[PDB]
Amino acid sequence: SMSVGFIGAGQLAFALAKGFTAAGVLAAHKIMASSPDMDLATVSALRKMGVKLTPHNKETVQHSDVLFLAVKPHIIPFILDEIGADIEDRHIVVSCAAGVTISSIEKKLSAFRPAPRVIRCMTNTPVVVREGATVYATGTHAQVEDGRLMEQLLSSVGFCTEVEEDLIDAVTGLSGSGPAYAFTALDALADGGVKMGLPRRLAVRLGAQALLGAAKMLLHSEQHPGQLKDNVSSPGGATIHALHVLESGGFRSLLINAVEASCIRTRELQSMAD
Amino acid sequence: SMSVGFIGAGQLAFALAKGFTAAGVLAAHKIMASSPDMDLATVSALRKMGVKLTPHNKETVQHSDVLFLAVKPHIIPFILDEIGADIEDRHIVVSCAAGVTISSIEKKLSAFRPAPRVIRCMTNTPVVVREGATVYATGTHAQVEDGRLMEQLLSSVGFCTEVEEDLIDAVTGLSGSGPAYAFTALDALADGGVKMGLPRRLAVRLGAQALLGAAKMLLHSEQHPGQLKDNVSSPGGATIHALHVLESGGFRSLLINAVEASCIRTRELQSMAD
Amino acid sequence: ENLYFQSMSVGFIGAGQLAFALAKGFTAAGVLAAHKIMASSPDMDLATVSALRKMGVKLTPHNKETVQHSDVLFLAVKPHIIPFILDEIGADIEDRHIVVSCAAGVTISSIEKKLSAFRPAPRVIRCMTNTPVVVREGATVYATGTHAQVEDGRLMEQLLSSVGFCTEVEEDLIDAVTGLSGSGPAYAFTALDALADGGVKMGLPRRLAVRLGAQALLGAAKMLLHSEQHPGQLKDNVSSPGGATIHALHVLESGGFRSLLINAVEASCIRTRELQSMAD
Amino acid sequence: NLYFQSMSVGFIGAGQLAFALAKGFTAAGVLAAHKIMASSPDMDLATVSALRKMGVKLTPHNKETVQHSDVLFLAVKPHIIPFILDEIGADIEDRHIVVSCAAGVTISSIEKKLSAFRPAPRVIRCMTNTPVVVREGATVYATGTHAQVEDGRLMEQLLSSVGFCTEVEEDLIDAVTGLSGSGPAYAFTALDALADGGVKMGLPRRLAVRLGAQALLGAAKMLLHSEQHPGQLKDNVSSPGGATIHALHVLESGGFRSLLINAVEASCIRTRELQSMAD
Amino acid sequence: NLYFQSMSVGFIGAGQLAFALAKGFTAAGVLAAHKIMASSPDMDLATVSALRKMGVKLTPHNKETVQHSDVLFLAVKPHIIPFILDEIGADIEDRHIVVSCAAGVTISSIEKKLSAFRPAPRVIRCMTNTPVVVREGATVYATGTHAQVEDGRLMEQLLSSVGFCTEVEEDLIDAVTGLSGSGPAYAFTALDALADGGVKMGLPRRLAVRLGAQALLGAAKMLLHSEQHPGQLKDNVSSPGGATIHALHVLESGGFRSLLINAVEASCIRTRELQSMAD
Ligand SMILES: O=C(O)[C@@H]1CS[C@@]2(c3ccccc3)CCC(=O)N12
Ligand SMILES: O=C(O)[C@@H]1CS[C@@]2(c3ccccc3)CCC(=O)N12
């Protein structure tokens, strides 16, 4: 019974739209999206799925109750300055642009109507398989039900919890960038499998199934990841030999470095927005 | 309508038993397990689940149609030399000991009855959440239906495919050791999340959800993991900055090193069995 | 208590660091009188011999005298000296003796073959211990030999439990145990010297920096021994988000700190196997 | 045989430090659990859940803690401090000793905030660690401008009951944080790694954890009880050509010492930043 | 304007190399697709599926390929070779030229296996790469004991139609494998990394891949067409103080050159091992 709109019809808009429609919380036709390049693969794919597509952001705003902002962070202040006169009391504006603060969206839109309902959101592509990791912060004028509607909607395509907005730059470095860390990891493990004699197809399937299963084990365990590592590593065995070589390369510090660098870049993108 | 037995009641026996019973392919009472330390956490846990527990490996052999060998590779030739007179025509002997070849099991058991039906198996702990990665090779006397019964049984707790036996040492390095690589990875990402300001609980949940989701994306995509990495990495963005720092530490080579080292150790354990 | 009234006579062949540590520990525990202990060395000019002499331990340059005095006979010499000792005193081992080898890596099998040429059932126990027995906080393991009676392992556990932790292991674990708890205190002394340098770099007086670093190590170890929790779970509990600790942990990770300790256990274990393999 | 029959203790914050100190104080018998009260904003914390079992009084209102307490521990994150002081600052009284455990938060900043309500607040800055839960903590404290002489002596008496405790100049606390405050986390990492080492060479995990922890425990005790340099204790274990000296070489080859120096330095520098990026 | 009107080609193996060469040969117009036949044990291979679309004749029986072919490419893994030769060795005839593309497999080993059936088998060893699919392959070949002079000339003519091709002594083929045989994979890695570089600095991914590939393409063409040392071409781009020379410094600081040397060396040494661990 809700109308959803996407400004930007790229990778994130499609993932969210595909996830929502797959989840059954939203029918594809209750979704409208608009993009600048009106002939992109994501925009055509939305058409086959049943999403209404348009090149006019104003038409998208006019149709939606909940309006997702799915554009690069530097496009954001132009979208708000271009569509701000079109926001109404009914609108919930959900920003997904990396680093863009609730403050700037609220300051830009307040020039038009004084109590914009803004929610900042950080999600990732696996919403397309309904296994996303999502956090959101509610803005100054976001009503109580607004956070609940947001939590209800995004929980249908993965994990979702509210955070203080000052955690979102860090969450970006962990679960926002996370899937790319996993994709790099899977390509390399596949190279390893292939070096040791496995066909590439089998190596990719096995490496992925292992991560999927391991992550699920942690999610279902009350136990520390180190204790699971302990549980798996038989004395003198193959696994403990492999863990040693990871440690010798500082494997842990590399992933720590990555979360930090992604978080810090997100702060740089936010600080260059002001 | 099948009777299953486990020799060894440790981590792998429990994971498989818990997975099978959770999957509904096997009732807990159609499973019997035996262990040396008859007062271990895994042995007590099997009791609460409904698995029959015993300290006599002979009683386990007498009850089972399918008999899982879930012991360390050096215990294997003593188990076979101790229980070999008890194998019958009905028995399917499924070895899970790392590195132990079908040849040695067939040579040890042939001293008792001449056509032992042996299947070598490589699996991992996530069968406990029915997301295991399993491969198996059928032995000299394994009938046609034997591979099918094996594939049917282990597919119910995760992925399962037949391989040539000479791939299993490599598969061990990839999906056998895989979950421990993931557990180390999740602990470090959690350290990273925590360094950048996230609560530890939230960082573990987000890091795990990200891996679960990313792995599922790869499993459901026809696309190369590099193309998914490309799809996720917006120009100038946080993710591409994080991927750079991974590359600078040779992140890929570390995971390649790990699969290789686990595979090579598995060959060493097999070569020390002979 | 029962070992005191057991009125045991102990001998050490070799009067080096380990003999002194165990003698110091035993006497500190009250299980043994210092004069009911006899030790022997070919060089009477070590400080360890002076400390034993000052303690009241009986000292002699003749190993046979140490064998004749002993009920429990500790072999505390470098792994290559072992077969020359066994050849020299092997005729003197008696049925009453419990022979406890403390040499790194030297197998029970090798000791039994040497001694079986003299008496058919030598009672042999192999031991791996460490210097903190001197403050009764040692880490000790032992494996019982072919002819060790059940009471021999029980007496051994009681004697060594009085100076720290003690448990029986299968013998094929002792090499790994050497690399972990036998060499362990040296890793810790190195770590404490360095943490103290860290303190001094950041402005602490040296005495204070040494004191605090050791107390922290002691307290963390004690927390682990008393906790049912994984050491990583303890790590999380102290590491507040954005905090000082998590920043310090990061730079540890960036140097491969974990892999250095793994390398250390491994190299010590491998060297131990080499020391016996060079006794072939 | 020490016991503070007329002292009331309160904790602002019901996290890790509050629980460790309360468990330590009660373990020592110096304080009854019912004479201790704690407060938290998340009454669904694992530590706050645990505090209920020991018998410590729990409340969600910091004012209730301040009102029931003589000695008030501030066990909150350093950024929470200036909001906490604003909430209860009007409730501080002459009897109160305010003991800050927040990393980096200076005596000056607490005194300036509290002086706005009543002049001469009695403030003591403290740096402690989690092993107070097993009464082997390392604690230092610096006394504020208005803390009487009996104020530090009482705190030393209380904190000596859960481990080592000494007074230091306040400008040592940032470095002490990097050494003994963060110290236990370096040790937990070390014990995990050593146990991985043991497991690689064939030890059961349980045994490897036990032996590694016992070795660290024992060596630390040897150092505390010896008058000798840690290098001299190092020498005693390192028999010529032996197993230990080979392992020491590979530690040296990786710069093991410098890693531990880097860690203390990094924890102290972060502590300075948290203080300076507050003020 | 070249065309082998009386030649029949067969592939044992329907994998990557079979498909690349067949696509290349047909792209050049030198061979009609229906005059080409391939065989595979997995008739559900992506490449074997692709071969059907081009019109190449497909069969699961290696004997059928041998019987229909004049020139027979062995496009199988080096361990499959001695079992393949055992299956069709009795089917080799005087008209046959057997061209091995298996890495490391020596002319000697193929000739010894095939001489057991008919003496004087005509054998040519070949090392090629996947860019033959765009007619820019690098191919070398060594002729066997019984290959007539016209045998190598015919092969050079055929393989020159899909890229560079020259005859070498057989003991160069292991190194050529490490240079040009593995060469394209190093380049694909390089282009992925360069595109990551472009994307980091703000380029769209599509554009970064296009520009990176074009730069590699163009530089390679410059080298092939220039009489000058690659260092001299390097100098021409590196204006004093400029952007390029700063980037060259960071390549040097990571030992970029030595990595590419390590790679050729490692691929050649593995190739030697695969040959020696067969025989
Ligand atoms: O010397 C060594 O490297 C190792 C490490 S522990 C042990 C030792 C214990 C106590 C004091 C001195 C040495 C037992 C004998 C031996 O070889 N050890
Ligand atoms: O000099 C350089 O590092 C860069 C790299 S490309 C360009 C160049 C193109 C062709 C020949 C020489 C230089 C354009 C001018 C300039 O500055 N360039």
User: A166 and A151 in contact (C-beta within 8 Å)?
Assistant: no
**Proximal ligand: closest to the CA of C14:** 1
CA distance A195 to A29: 48
Cβ contacts of B151 within 8 Å, gap of 6 or more: B136, B160, B161, B162
Q: Identify which of E277, E73, E275 has the alpha carbon closest to the alpha carbon of residue E175.
A: E275
The sheet with strand A117-122 has its strands ordered as A52-54, A31-34, A4-7, A66-69, A92-95, A117-122, A132-138, A158-162
Q: Tell me the one-letter amino acid at A157.
A: V
CA distance C196 to C214: 9
Residue carrying structure tokens 């494997």? A251
Distance of CA C178 to the CA centre of its chain: 8
CA distance A251 to chain C (A): 8
Q: Whose CA is nearest to atom 16 of ligand 1?
A: C104
3-state secondary structure of E100: strand
CA E203, distance to chain mean position in Å, is 33
> What is the Cα–Cα distance from B64 to C255, expressed in whole angstroms?
51
Dihedral sign for Cα atoms in the order C94, C100, C104, C109: positive
Residue keyed to tokens 């994130």: A12
E42 near B CB under 8 A = no
DSSP state of E107: H
List, in order, residues 6 or more apart from C208 with CB less than 8 Å away: C199, D166, D168, D172
> Would you give the distance in Å from CA B32 to the centre of its chain?
19
Residue E140 CA to residue E152 CA, distance in Å, equals 11
Q: Rounded to the nearest 5°, which phi and psi values hold at B132?
A: -75, 165
Pairwise CA distance, residues C75 & C83, whole Å:
11
Quote the distance between the C-alpha of residue B38 and its chain's center: 23
Q: What is the 3-state secondary structure (H, E, C) of chain A?
A: CCCEEEECCCHHHHHHHHHHHHHCCCCHHHEEEECCCCCCHHHHHHHHHCCEEECCHHHHHHHCCEEEECCCCCCHHHHHHHHHHHCCCCCEEEECCCCCCHHHHHHHHHCCCCCCEEEEEECCHHHHHCCEEEEEEECCCCCHHHHHHHHHHHHCCEEEEECCHHHHHHHHHHHHCHHHHHHHHHHHHHHHHHHCCCCHHHHHHHHHHHHHHHHHHHHHCCCCHHHHHHHHCCCCCHHHHHHHHHHHCCHHHHHHHHHHHHHHHHHHHHHCCC
Bridging pattern class, strands A117-122 and A132-138: antiparallel
Whether ligand 1 lies within 6 angstroms of the CB of C17 is answered as: yes
- Cα-Cα end-to-end distance for chain E: 42
Calpha distance E16→C39 (Å, rounded): 76
* Radius of gyration from C-alpha coordinates of chain A: 21
- Strand, coil or helix: what is E140? strand
Nearest to B187 among C232, C247, C250 (CB): C232
SS3 for C72?
Answer: strand
Q: Which of B258, B274, B120, B268 is nearest to A196 (CA)?
A: B258
- The residue among C222, C164, C163, C217 whose CA lies nearest residue C190 is C217
Rounded alpha-carbon distances, angstroms, from residue A190 to A186, B178, B263, E15: 6, 11, 13, 19
Contacts of C206 (CB under 8 A, 6+ apart): C196, C199, C200
Give the gap in angstroms from C-alpha A89 to the nearest C-alpha of chain D. 33
End-to-end CA distance of chain C: 41
The single residue listed with the structure tokens 């992140």 is B251
CB-based contacts of E168, cutoff 8 Å, min separation 6: E140, E141, E142, E176
Q: Residue D175, Cα to own-chain centre: how many angstroms?
A: 13
On the CB side of C126, CA atoms within 13 Å amount to 24
Residues after which chain C has a gap (C–N > 2.5 Å): none
Does C102 sit in the ligand 1 pocket, CB within 6 Å?
yes
Q: What is the DSSP letter of C194?
A: H
Over the Cα atoms of chain E, what is R_g? 21
B3 vs B202: CA distance, rounded Å = 43
| D5 assigned to a ligand binding site | no
The number of CA neighbours under 13 Å toward the Cβ of B143 is 7
CA distance C23 to C29: 10
In whole angstroms, give the CA distance from residue C65 to residue C179. 33
Distance of alpha carbon A133 from alpha carbon A175, whole angstroms? 6
State the nearest Cα–Cα gap between B43 and chain C, in angstroms. 20
The one-letter amino acid code at B150 reads M
Query: In which residue are the tokens 């060493």 written?
Result: B268
Between the alpha carbon of residue D103 and those of residues D30, D126, D181, D182, the distances in Å are: 26, 9, 9, 11
Searching chain A, which residue's CA lies closest to the CA of residue C265? Answer: A244
Residues B207, B212, B217, CA angle at the centre, nearest 5°? Answer: 125
Q: Which residues have CB under 8 Å from C196's CB, separation 6+?
A: C206, C209, C210, C213, D230
Give the sheet arrangement for strand B52-54, strand by strand: B52-54, B31-34, B4-7, B66-69, B92-95, B117-122, B132-138, B158-162
Helix (H, G, I), strand (E, B) or coil at B97: coil
E199 → closest Cβ in B226, B235, B247: B235
State residue A128 phi and psi, 5-degree precision: -65, -25
B133: Cβ–Cβ under 8 A, 6 or more apart, which residues? A206, A209, A210, A213, B123, B124, B126, B158, B159, B175, B178
Q: In this structure, are residues D41 and A164 in contact, taking their beta carbons and an 8 Å threshold? A: no
Output the CA torsion C110→C116→C118→C122 (10° steps). Answer: 100
| Beta carbon of E247 within 6 Å of any ligand 2 atom | no
Asked if E59 and E37 touch (Cβ cutoff 8 Å), the reply is: yes
Please, what sign has the CA dihedral across residues A165, A171, A177, A179? negative
Q: Tell me which residue has tokens 């706005």.
A: D116
Q: Where do the H-state alpha helices sit in E55-172?
A: 62-68, 81-88, 107-115, 149-160
Q: Which two tokens stand for residue A105?
A: 């969206």
Q: Cα(C45)–Cα(D88) distance, rounded to whole angstroms? A: 69
Q: Report CA-CA distances (Å) from E79 to A21, B164, B165, C50, E119.
A: 50, 14, 16, 70, 23
E strand or H helix at C10, and its extent?
Answer: strand C10-13
Tokens standing for residue B152: 């049917």
Neighbour count for residue E238 (Cβ, 10 Å)? 15
The pair of structure tokens assigned to D133 is 């839960």
Count CB neighbours of B161 within 10 A. 15
Angstrom CA distances, D208 to A170, A231, B151, C173, D214, stand at 36, 13, 38, 10, 10
Tokens representing E166?
């020259």
User: How many angstroms separate the most distant Cα atoms in chain A?
Assistant: 68
Q: How many residues are recorded in chain A? A: 274
Instruction: With beta carbons less than 8 A apart as the criterion, state whether D123 and D114 touch.
Output: yes
Question: What is the spatial distance between Cα C89 and Cα E154, in angstroms, rounded to a whole number?
Answer: 85
* CA atoms of C125 and C101, how far apart (whole Å): 6
Give the separation between CA E113 and CA C117, rounded to whole angstroms.
Answer: 60
Q: Which of residues 185-204 of B touch C (CB under 8 A)?
A: 187-188, 190-191, 194-200
Q: Is B157 annotated as a binding residue?
A: no
Task: Work out whether strand B117-122 and strand B132-138 pair parallel, antiparallel, or are unpaired.
Answer: antiparallel
Q: How far apart (Å, rounded) are the C-alpha atoms in residues D101 and D24?
A: 15
Q: Which residues contact A33 (CB under 8 A, 6 or more apart)?
A: A5, A6, A7, A8, A9, A13, A17, A43, A46, A51, A52, A53, A54, A60
d(CA B176, CA C252): 29
* E166 contacts E155 by C-beta, under 8 angstroms: no
User: What is the DSSP annotation of chain D?
Assistant: ----TT--EEEE--SHHHHHHHHHHHHTTSS-GGGEEEE-S-TT-HHHHHHHHHT-EEES-HHHHHHH-SEEEE-S-TTTHHHHHHHHGGG--TT-EEEE-STT--HHHHHHHHHTTSSS-EEEEEE--GGGGGT-EEEEEEE-SS--HHHHHHHHHHHHTTEEEEE--GGGHHHHIIIIITHHHHHHHHHHHHHHHHHHTT--HHHHHHHHHHHHHHHHHHHHH-SS-HHHHHHHH--TT-HHHHHHHHHHHTTHHHHHHHHHHHHHHHHHHHHHTT-
Ligand that comes closest to the CA of residue C12: 1
Cα separation, D127 vs D138, in Å, equals: 8
**Residue at token pair 């019901």:** D14
* Stretch (H or E) spanning E236: helix E230-237
Query: What is the signed CA dihedral for E231, E232, E238, E244, rounded to 10 degrees?
Result: -30
Please choose, from the candidates E129, E161, E158, E128, the residue with its C-alpha nearest in 3D space to the C-alpha of residue E28. E161
Whole-angstrom distance, CA of residue D45 vs CA of residue D76: 13
Backbone angles phi, psi at B92, to 5 degrees: -110, 120
CA distance B168 to B204: 32
How is B104-154 classified by DSSP, letter by letter?
HHHHHHHTTSS--EEEEEE--GGGGGT-EEEEEEE-SS--HHHHHHHHHHH
| DSSP letters spanning C125-169 | EEEE--GGGGGT-EEEEEEE-SS--HHHHHHHHHHHHTTEEEEE-
H or E, element range at C115: helix C108-116
Provide the residue type at E213 as one letter. Answer: A
| CB burial of residue D1 (10 Å; 0-12, 13-18, 19+) | exposed
| Residue A264, both tokens | 């810090």
Choosing from E233, E238, E244 the residue with most ligand 2 atoms within 8 A of its CB, the one to mutate for a pocket test is E244
Q: Which of A 241-260 lie inside 8 A of D, CB atoms? A: 241, 243-244, 247
**Is the Cβ–Cβ distance between E62 and E87 less than 8 Å?**
yes
Decide: D256 and C194 in contact? Cβ < 8 Å. Answer: yes
What six digits make up the tokens of A41?
């693969």
**What residues contact residue E37 under an 8 Å CB cut-off, 6+ apart?**
E8, E9, E10, E11, E56, E57, E58, E59, E64, E65, E68, E69
Decide if B173 contacts A196 (C-beta within 8 A): yes
Distances (CA, A) of C188 to C221, D214, D216, D219, D248: 11, 11, 6, 6, 11
CB neighbourhood size of D202 (10 A): 19
What the block records as the tokens of D77 is: 């994150």
For the purposes of burial, counting CB atoms within 10 Å of the CB of A173, is it exposed (0-12), middle (13-18) or buried (19 or more)? buried
SS3 B211: helix
Give the separation between CA D94 and CA B29, rounded to whole angstroms: 70
DSSP letter at E78 equals: T
Find tokens 């920043």 and name the residue. Answer: C247
In a 3-state reduction of DSSP, which class is residue B9?
Answer: coil
Tell me which H or E stretch contains C6.
Answer: helix C2-6
For E183-186, which contacts have Cβ atoms below 8 Å and span 24 or more sequence positions? E183/E129, E183/E138, E184/E129, E184/E130, E184/E131, E186/E260, E186/E263
Q: What is the DSSP letter of B64?
A: -
Nearest residue in B to E203, CA atom: B235
| Closest CA relative to residue B194, chosen from A260, C92, C20 | A260
Residue B111: both structure tokens together: 């001293």
* Helix (H) / strand (E) containing C11: strand C10-13
In degrees to the nearest 10, what's the CA dihedral of B251, B252, B254, B260? 170
Largest CA distance in chain D: 68
Residue B239: its H or E element: helix B238-248
Helix B178-195 × helix A225-232 angle, to 10° = 160
Query: Cβ-count burial of C81 within 10 angstroms (0-12 exposed, 13-18 middle, 19+ buried)?
Result: middle
